[PDB]
């Protein structure tokens, strides 16, 4: 039965892949990094507190200037902050209050957001009549939008619960490229520093690297025991970290095509919600559900510092592009800047 | 350059006072999530009360109730978008004797969710008239699907409607206790389940959600002051 013959050749391929993976596993990252000195205790403190949201914040994204940032809360609002002076620059009401992601275009001209309406909405901040309003609205997903990030002022990538990611042409509103292959809900995506590729973490406990311009999945990494909730890129561009519900963080390399390190303690039994590296990639910040944020040493797997101060699950985080500070959004309806 | 600082300060002032009016509106709206299988009565309940969303007012108190429709079936992650809702309205078909275990398992998975640990559920045991039809016909008996029903005794606190066959009373109170046996098994008083017998033609199913949202707020305020 040709279905059983495809299942057999499938397993044959899975064992050729496991062998080609153990073939290049000549060492471990811990043996390599055992002679480095530990980063020491890193105790950042709340330098700013950005209040205003009436409900749980669910997504945030710094701007390129490392000064403004946007936060999306499920009270139906999308607030833009001037993080230096804690002033609000804009307060965009949303037609659907169940927003789940929000992005800030690298030109600072547009903001995007989407959620259970299955629609990615673009808002022009540099409007000419005065006020930011809707410009485009990207439809096509049969599932909820979990993450989205601009490439430029006309290309935007989305992640959805229909187990697909899509590259959009904001003007025509057409999905210029579709990325399919994930079995479970895609929860987070992160574009590489050179826009050329991007990764996605899905609820099938797998991460996938996608070629933006060609629309094919190049590599699929596994190892997590449950849903991947957050993902980033290492600042270099050849590695990325994932956090999943199994209370573990894992660092994958693109060129070696397998996991390098797992970040865990047997007293943490909670699901990681957001991940992000520092500017040099030495520090990996993760936002567990147990209201804390752990700052891990991305090279030694040692836990180094904690960011306590939230009264509910820390839902999101993000490091500035200059590396000057990190922001944390939580379900307590507050964002806190740390440095 | 201080002038742009004063312009930013008055932009912040206009923002905060718009956000204050928005805060009062958001503070007085009770969000309700409608959940339940298809081949049930959720959409009929929304049609009778009068999309994804519904907005209705009871006694000058507005509610906006939403049932999510265009998703897949793995609701394990968008469900956490409703951790702060006032109540979950769970609709079940009492007349579908074998997809009823699916409803019990979904209620159990919702009730023990780590992020809906404090969300009380209003249980609508819908389609009671068809259930009475099936019970009086005696062609598909509950014991073949739930053998506990053979030894089950109608509770002494039961209030049957005029003319109701004791077989129907035992059937609907058995489904009632099948869901209450789950809700009382692990609720540490943070939340409760409120069963109600409904049919597709019932018109008061808004006053019931009002009554029980009020009861949920009462019990939250009690358990807050350590009384209850």
């Amino acid at each position, epitope marked *: 039965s040709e279905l059983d013959q495809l*299942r057999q050749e499938a397993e044959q391929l*899975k064992n050729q892949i496991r062998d080609a993976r153990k073939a290049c596993a000549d060492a471990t990252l811990s043996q390599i990094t055992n002679n480095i000195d530990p980063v020491g205790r890193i105790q950042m403190r709340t330098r700013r507190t950005l209040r205003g949201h009436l409900a749980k914040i669910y997504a945030m994204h710094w701007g390129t200037d490392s000064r403004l940032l946007v936060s999306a809360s499920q009270d139906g609002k999308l607030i833009i902050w001037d993080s230096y002076t804690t002033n609000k620059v804009h307060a965009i009401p949303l037609r659907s209050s169940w927003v789940m992601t929000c992005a800030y275009a690298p030109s600072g001209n547009y903001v995007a957001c989407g959620g259970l309406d299955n629609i990615c909405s673009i808002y022009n901040l540099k409007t000419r009549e005065g006020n930011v309003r809707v410009s485009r609205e990207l439809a096509g997903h049969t599932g909820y939008l979990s993450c989205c990030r601009f490439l430029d002022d006309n290309q935007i990538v989305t992640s959805s619960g229909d*187990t697909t990611c899509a590259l959009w042409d904001i003007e025509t509103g057409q999905q210029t490229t579709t990325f399919t292959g994930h*079995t*479970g809900d895609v929860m987070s995506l992160s574009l590489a520093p050179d826009t050329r590729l991007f990764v996605s973490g899905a*609820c*099938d*406990a*797998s991460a996938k690297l996608w070629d933006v311009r060609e629309g094919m999945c190049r590599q699929t990494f*596994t*190892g997590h*025991e*449950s*849903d991947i909730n957050a993902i980033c890129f290492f600042p270099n561009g050849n590695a990325f970290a994932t956090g999943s*519900d*199994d*209370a573990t963080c894992r660092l994958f390399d693109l060129r070696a095509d397998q996991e390098l390190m797992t970040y865990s303690h047997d007293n943490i*039994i909670c*699901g990681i919600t957001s991940v992000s590296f520092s500017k040099s990639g030495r520090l990996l910040l993760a936002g567990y559900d147990d209201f804390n944020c752990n700052v891990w040493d991305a090279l030694k797997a040692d836990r180094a510092g904690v960011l306590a101060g939230h009264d509910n699950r820390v839902s999101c985080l993000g490091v500035t592009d200059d590396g000057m500070a990190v922001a944390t959004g939580s379900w307590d309806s507050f964002l806190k800047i740390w440095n | 350059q201080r002038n742009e600082e004063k312009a930013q300060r008055e932009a912040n002032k206009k923002i905060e006072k718009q956000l204050q009016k928005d805060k009062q509106v958001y503070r007085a709206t009770h969000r309700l999530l409608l959940l339940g299988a298809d081949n049930s009565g959720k959409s009929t309940i929304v049609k009778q009360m009068r999309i994804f969303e519904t907005k209705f007012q009871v006694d000058k108190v507005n509610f906006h109730m939403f049932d999510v429709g265009g998703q*897949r*079936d*793995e*609701r*394990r992650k968008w469900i956490q978008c409703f951790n702060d809702v006032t109540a979950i309205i769970f609709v079940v078909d009492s007349s579908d004797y074998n997809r009823l*275990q*699916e409803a019990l*398992n*979904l209620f*159990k*998975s*919702i009730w*023990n*969710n*780590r992020w809906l640990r404090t969300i009380s559920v209003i249980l609508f045991l819908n389609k009671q008239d068809l259930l009475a039809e099936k019970v009086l016909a005696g062609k598909s008996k509950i014991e*073949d*699907y*739930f*053998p*506990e029903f053979a030894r089950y005794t109608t509770p002494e606190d039961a209030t049957p409607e005029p003319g109701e066959d004791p077989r129907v009373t035992r059937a609907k109170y058995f489904i009632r206790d099948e869901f209450l046996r789950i809700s009382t098994a*692990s609720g540490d008083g943070r939340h409760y389940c409120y069963p109600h017998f409904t049919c597709a033609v019932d018109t008061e199913n808004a006053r019931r959600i009002f009554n029980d949202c009020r009861d949920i707020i009462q019990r939250m305020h009690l358990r807050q002051y350590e009384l209850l």
Partner: nanobody
Framework: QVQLQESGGGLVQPGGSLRLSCAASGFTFSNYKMNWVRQAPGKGLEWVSD????????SYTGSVKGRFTISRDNAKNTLYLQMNSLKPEDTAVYYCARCPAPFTRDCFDVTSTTYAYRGQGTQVTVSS
């Protein structure tokens, strides 16, 4: 990579017996609540029985209550659905599902088409 291999299950006359062995590889077996989801031909997925983190609390669908048992062995990393007195309607594929989160009591794993942490199936057939 989480993968679940079921074994056992073949043509068995009514009132017969079988034992379905679900071996799990790729995670920590003890943390996860396990279920048996069977699919009869022409109908959606159906949930049979679940066993808790350590075999502490087990629970059954009504139709298989008093007939089948469900045992978990963390040593060999597996669980077994021992079926006895099989009826002509217990003929179905038997996926061995895992709940999607450790250290918790909820799961949503009877899904319509695609759930990522259940196996492939051992078609158990029962007829005369």
């Amino acid at each position: 990579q989480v993968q679940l291999q079921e074994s056992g299950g073949g043509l068995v006359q009514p009132g017969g017996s079988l034992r379905l062995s679900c071996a799990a590889s790729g995670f920590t077996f003890s943390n996860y609540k396990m279920n048996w989801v069977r699919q009869a031909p022409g109908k959606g997925l159906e949930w049979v029985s679940d066993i808790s983190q350590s075999g502490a609390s087990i629970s059954y669908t009504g139709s298989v209550k008093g007939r089948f048992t469900i045992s978990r062995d963390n040593a060999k990393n597996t669980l077994y659905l021992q079926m006895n007195s099989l009826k002509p309607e217990d003929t179905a594929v038997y996926y061995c599902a895992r709940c999607p989160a450790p250290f918790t009591r909820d799961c949503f794993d009877v899904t319509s088409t695609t759930y990522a942490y259940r196996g492939q199936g051992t078609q158990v057939t029962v007829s005369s």
